[PDB]
Amino acid sequence: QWALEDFEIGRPLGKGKFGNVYLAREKQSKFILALKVLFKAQLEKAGVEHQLRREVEIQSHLRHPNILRLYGYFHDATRVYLILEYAPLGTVYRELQKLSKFDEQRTATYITELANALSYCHSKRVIHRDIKPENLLLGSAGELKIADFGWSVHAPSSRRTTLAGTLDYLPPEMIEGRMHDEKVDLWSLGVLCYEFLVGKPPFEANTYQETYKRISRVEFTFPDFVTEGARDLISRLLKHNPSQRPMLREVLEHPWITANSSKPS
Ligand SMILES: Nc1ncnc2c1ncn2[C@@H]1O[C@H](COP(=O)(O)OP(=O)(O)O)[C@@H](O)[C@H]1O
Ligand SMILES: CCOc1ccc([C@@H](C)N)cc1
Ligand SMILES: [Mg+2]
Ligand SMILES: [Mg+2]
């Protein structure tokens, strides 16, 4: 159906390990969108064809205001192209670089939006497993949208693919290669809440080997400026035992969330 010829390409929006993402406009309709380009040679070399298939299948069927739309795809014998919803206000990653730290209202609002989106995903037993600021994008009204479903699966699951970059957002059970489920995304939600308020994630360290140690032992501390309500929510999410982590409905009804979020469940 679609082909490269149908689009005018514009400026680079961002880069990923595999993805090279561009602004684009479809010629007949003038519809503005994002084109995510993947190189077939690099896909085959890393052996991640199944992840690409998952990304397309899972993301094209989900419909939620806080989840990024995937409209389709095409390919041309060197490249694969995913057709995505364009997020005009960029990444949460960039926004944190700009401001250093978020205040409590901003943080609580982002956490509410994330919990709404994940609750929807989990009701289909879809777990994302790669929630981190570079994969959280912003819509025209500044609302958060989860993207990059390449690592997503159906629970419960093992891990069959090599971990690539940072360990910072992953729970103990996933770094230790054990069996895991939906609770992995609750752990990541805790890591994000901390990084949003403090400016760096809680198990950050100079080497892979030391980061691993801090995560498996759940060794983190709070700066003085973090309030008691924030400490309570974050301490509840960062539990070594997955079954002790709260349900998303409990996060959405936490007193700190309800006192500070500008958006509802
Ligand atoms: N729909 C989009 N709108 C705006 N920017 C995007 C969009 N998709 C991706 N980006 C930018 O491109 C980067 C890589 O996209 P991503 O889908 O995460 O690739 P990878 O799978 O390689 O991580 C993102 O971190 C973001 O900076
Ligand atoms: C959803 C489509 O998935 C694909 C996966 C791999 C390839 C290439 C690498 N042979 C093309 C499509
Ligand atoms: Mg990504
Ligand atoms: Mg990916």
Swiss-Prot record:
There is a cross-link at K132 (Glycyl lysine isopeptide (Lys-Gly) (interchain with G-Cter in SUMO2)). Activation of CDK1, appears to be an upstream event of AURKA activation. Phosphatase inhibitor-2 (PPP1R2) and TPX2 act also as activators. Inactivated by the G2 checkpoint. Inhibited by GADD45A and p53/TP53, and through dephosphorylation by protein phosphatase type 1 (PP1). MLN8054 is also a potent and selective inhibitor. Activated during the early phase of cilia disassembly in the presence of CIMAP3. Inhibited by the small molecule inhibitor VX-680. The gene is AURKA. Centrosome amplification can occur when the cycles are uncoupled, and this amplification is associated with cancer and with an increase in the levels of chromosomal instability. Residues 154-167 are annotated as: Activation segment. GO terms for cellular component: axon hillock; basolateral plasma membrane; centriole; centrosome; chromosome passenger complex; ciliary basal body; cytosol; germinal vesicle. Highly expressed in testis and weakly in skeletal muscle, thymus and spleen. Also highly expressed in colon, ovarian, prostate, neuroblastoma, breast and cervical cancer cell lines. Induction: Expression is cell-cycle regulated, low in G1/S, accumulates during G2/M, and decreases rapidly after. The active site is at D130. Changing R79A: Reduces ubiquitination and proteasomal degradation. This is Aurora kinase A. Keywords: ATP-binding, Cell cycle, Cell division, Cell membrane, Cell projection, Cilium, Cilium biogenesis/degradation, Cytoplasm, Cytoskeleton, Isopeptide bond, Kinase, Membrane, Microtubule, Mitosis, Nucleotide-binding, Phosphoprotein, Proto-oncogene, Serine/threonine-protein kinase, Transferase, Ubl conjugation. Belongs to the protein kinase superfamily. Ser/Thr protein kinase family. Aurora subfamily. The modification Phosphothreonine is found at T161, T162. Its EC number is 2.7.11.1. Residues 7-257 form the Protein kinase domain. GO terms for biological process: anterior/posterior axis specification; apoptotic process; cell division; centrosome localization; cilium disassembly; G2/M transition of mitotic cell cycle; liver regeneration; mitotic cell cycle. Part of a complex composed of NEDD9, AURKA and CTTN; within the complex NEDD9 acts as a scaffold protein and is required for complex formation. Identified in a complex with AUNIP and NIN. Interacts with FBXL7. Interacts with CPEB1, JTB, TACC1, TPX2, PPP2CA, as well as with the protein phosphatase type 1 (PP1) isoforms PPP1CA, PPP1CB and PPP1CC. Also interacts with its substrates ARHGEF2, BORA, KIF2A, PARD3, and p53/TP53. Interaction with BORA promotes phosphorylation of PLK1. Interacts with CIMAP3. Interacts with GADD45A, competing with its oligomerization. Changing Q209A: Reduces binding to MYCN. GO terms for molecular function: ATP binding; histone H3S10 kinase activity; molecular function activator activity; protein heterodimerization activity; protein kinase activity; protein kinase binding; protein serine kinase activity; protein serine/threonine kinase activity. It catalyses: L-seryl-[protein] + ATP = O-phospho-L-seryl-[protein] + ADP + H(+); L-threonyl-[protein] + ATP = O-phospho-L-threonyl-[protein] + ADP + H(+). The keyword Zinc does not apply. Changing T161E: Enhances interaction with TPX2. It comes from the Eukaryota. The keyword Glycoprotein does not apply.
